[PDB]
Ligand binder design. Sequence first.
Ligand SMILES: *[C@@H]1O[C@@H](C)[C@@H](O)[C@@H](O[C@@H]2O[C@H](CO)[C@@H](O)[C@H](O)[C@H]2O)[C@@H]1O
Ligand SMILES: *[C@H]1O[C@H](CO)[C@@H](O)[C@H](O)[C@@H]1O
Ligand SMILES: *[C@H]1O[C@H](CO)[C@@H](O)[C@H](O)[C@@H]1O
Length: 52
Amino acid sequence: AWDEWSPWSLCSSTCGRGFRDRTRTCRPPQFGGNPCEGPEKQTKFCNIALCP
Ligand SMILES: *[C@@H]1O[C@@H](C)[C@@H](O)[C@@H](O[C@@H]2O[C@H](CO)[C@@H](O)[C@H](O)[C@H]2O)[C@@H]1O
Ligand SMILES: *[C@H]1O[C@H](CO)[C@@H](O)[C@H](O)[C@@H]1O
Ligand SMILES: *[C@H]1O[C@H](CO)[C@@H](O)[C@H](O)[C@@H]1O
């Protein structure tokens, strides 16, 4: 089982296309659990302003 996501980062670009990301680690293993392979990162597109 997965632990909670971290907050999203800010957009890596202050204008134009960039990335934002967040990460999570595994919860401690339990008897019978499906093994979790950690850490995991989620990345998405962002664009916060048009560049000059
Ligand atoms: C963040 O604020 C924006 C309003 C711009 O001033 C950014 O500077 C511009 O950033 C782009 C993308 O990294 C570069 O291509 C330009 O060289 C730069 O003027 C600022 O980082
Ligand atoms: C991260 O993603 C969402 C919150 O944005 C929820 O499913 C849960 O908090 C998860 O850790
Ligand atoms: C990232 O995205 C939103 C805020 O933009 C929230 O669900 C939370 O802050 C998450 O980390």
